[PDB]
């Protein structure tokens, strides 16, 4: 279990500074939700351990809070439209004479595509990918330790 | 079986806060419906266990409620049109001078496409995908425990 404070979160994300706009219990609830996506069981053998895991969790709560505040604000005609507003990465946008065309992320899976919707999720995905190297080897006993080798190693 | 309460759902989704707009019996009916898509049998050996499973069920209820409010509100000329309005992810939209083009989800299946149709279903799909890593293994017995190994292990 990892306890969620508000000082670190509010200094890390200055846009979520107003308590009136973002209550305490809202941030706490979204941290409890983010614990479901990423397990907060801290162990020293985990790839995500300590501050990396804490940053991953905080980024996910930022992602969820950004999506929720998008839902709440809307806006269609001063409120929430029917069915809400969907997320996802804006590949191309155009306002007036200005136009922007961004590169699409390599979202091969729904989890990655949902993460790419907001930049907090993009940073979380980047951290997960940069920590994802190699892998695990589960099972297997040291069979080689019973056979003698060069230079008298592991007789 | 998982008991559904109005309070957690309403604080989770502030858009569904008005009891007049979203009666209690409507939410309860959609919870009984969502129990079919995800079985609410809570077990400690399940990958969806406890709070993650409840969050998944609540997200699906929000999905179904969003489709229902899309249907009831409409609107074509002040009501519901013939054959209703279909869901699905808005890949590209254009209103006036404003244009938006979003990345398409990797929906390889009808269930995934229907989920990606709404933002609540998108979060549900992300949770299911992030919990769907590895897999199961049915059958099989500890055959190796009857054969001696290195270091006097499992003689």
């Amino acid at each position: 279990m990892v306890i969620f404070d508000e000082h670190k979160f509010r200094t890390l994300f200055p846009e979520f500074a107003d308590p009136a706009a973002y209550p305490d219990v809202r941030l706490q609830m979204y941290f409890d939700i983010a614990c479901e996506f990423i397990s907060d069981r801290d162990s020293p053998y985990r790839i995500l351990n300590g501050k990396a895991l804490e940053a991953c969790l905080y980024l996910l709560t930022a992602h969820l809070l950004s999506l929720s505040t998008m839902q709440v604000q809307g806006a269609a005609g001063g409120g929430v439209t029917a069915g809400g507003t969907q997320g996802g990465f804006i590949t191309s946008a155009t306002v007036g004479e200005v136009s922007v065309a961004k590169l699409a992320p390599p979202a091969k899976n729904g989890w990655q595509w949902w993460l790419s919707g907001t930049p907090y999720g993009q940073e979380l995905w980047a951290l997960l990918s940069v920590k994802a190297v190699g892998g695990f080897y589960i099972g297997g006993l040291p069979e080689r330790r019973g056979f003698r080798k060069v230079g008298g190693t592991f007789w | 079986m998982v008991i559904f309460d109005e309070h957690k759902f309403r604080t989770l989704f502030p858009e569904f806060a008005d009891p007049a707009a979203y009666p209690d019996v409507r939410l309860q009916m959609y919870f009984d419906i969502a129990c079919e898509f995800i079985s609410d049998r809570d077990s400690p050996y399940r990958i969806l266990n406890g709070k993650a499973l409840e969050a998944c069920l609540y997200l699906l209820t929000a999905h179904l409620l969003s489709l229902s409010t899309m249907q009831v509100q409409g609107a074509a000329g002040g009501g519901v049109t013939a054959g209703g309005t279909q869901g699905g992810f808005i890949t590209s939209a254009t209103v006036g001078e404003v244009s938006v083009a979003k990345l398409a989800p990797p929906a390889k299946n009808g269930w995934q496409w229907w989920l990606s149709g709404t933002p609540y279903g998108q979060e549900l799909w992300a949770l299911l995908s992030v919990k769907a890593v590895g897999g199961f293994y049915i059958g099989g017995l500890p055959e190796r425990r009857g054969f001696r190994k290195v270091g006097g292990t499992f003689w």
Binding site: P142, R145, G146, F154, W155 | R148, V150, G151, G152, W155
Partner: peptide, 25 residues
């Protein structure tokens, strides 16, 4: 010196017991 892995691999072959011998016979 004997290695630890070979040593306890050989040491694990202790006396099983008279009850075990009778039940295996």
């Amino acid at each position: 010196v004997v290695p630890t892995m070979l040593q306890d691999w050989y040491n694990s072959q202790g006396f099983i017991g008279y009850q075990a011998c009778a039940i295996i016979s």
